[PDB]
Amino acid sequence: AEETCFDKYTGNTYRVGDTYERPKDSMIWDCTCIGAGRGRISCTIANRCHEGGQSYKIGDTWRRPHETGGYMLECVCLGNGKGEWTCKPI
Amino acid sequence: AEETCFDKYTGNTYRVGDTYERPKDSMIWDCTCIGAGRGRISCTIANRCHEGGQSYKIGDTWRRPHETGGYMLECVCLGNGKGEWTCKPI
């Protein structure tokens, strides 16, 4: 037995030092059972986009051909706690 | 008139280039109306704690006397999209 945290969103009990993914509201948070005597959990959310094997900061842009269309796209990383991006024709 | 975004959480319309705060689920997201031809909004959330005039990364710790109790506290920055921290006596 070790000190634990209980995550009401995954429904699981973790031991202090465990790290895990918490699906919440169509996001994935990256969490750690800290404990701190009180079952305290620390979670971070990604503020970056991952597209086509590249990583982008929020506000970064990139251009690429559409994969079946062949017309150029300009894309921007939005983030929104989901690694969301948007592309449009150029 | 300029191109706009509509934020369903604040209920406001923004013009492209506007930045604002979006209260959502007891958090504050920092948003920008990007537009990108389609009313696209980009939002970031803080993964840091601000306590006693200091800034802390998630997982940072600090010690301080309790402000009315005078006993030592050990604190840790949890984050959780809220700049949340926890303290206990030491």
Q: For residue A36, what are the domain limits?
A: 1-46
Give the total number of structural domains in chain B.
2
**One domain for residues A36 and A59:** no
- Supply the Cα-derived Rg of chain B in whole angstroms: 18
Cβ neighbours, 10 Å, residue A46:
18
Name the residue among A29, A40, A31, A37 with its Cα closest to residue A5.
A40
Cα distances from A86 to residues A28, B30, B41, in angstroms, run: 19, 18, 10
**One domain for residues A88 and A56:** yes
Chain A residues with CB under 8 Å of a chain B CB are 25, 29, 32, 34, 36-38, 40-45, 47, 58-59, 74, 76-81, 86, 88
Name the residue among B58, B35, B36, B34 with its Cα closest to residue B45.
B58
User: Which experimental method was this entry solved with?
Assistant: X-ray
DSSP-based three-state secondary structure for B52: coil
- Supply the Cα-derived Rg of chain A in whole angstroms: 18
Amino acid found at A3? E
Q: Taking CB atoms and an 8 Å cutoff, what residues of chain A touch B36?
A: 74, 76, 86, 88
**One domain for residues B1 and B40:** yes
What six digits make up the tokens of B71?
């006993």
* Count of CA atoms in the C-beta half-sphere (13 A) of B4: 7
Are residues A32 and B15 in contact, defined by beta-carbon separation less than 8 angstroms?
A: no
**One domain for residues B42 and B76:** no
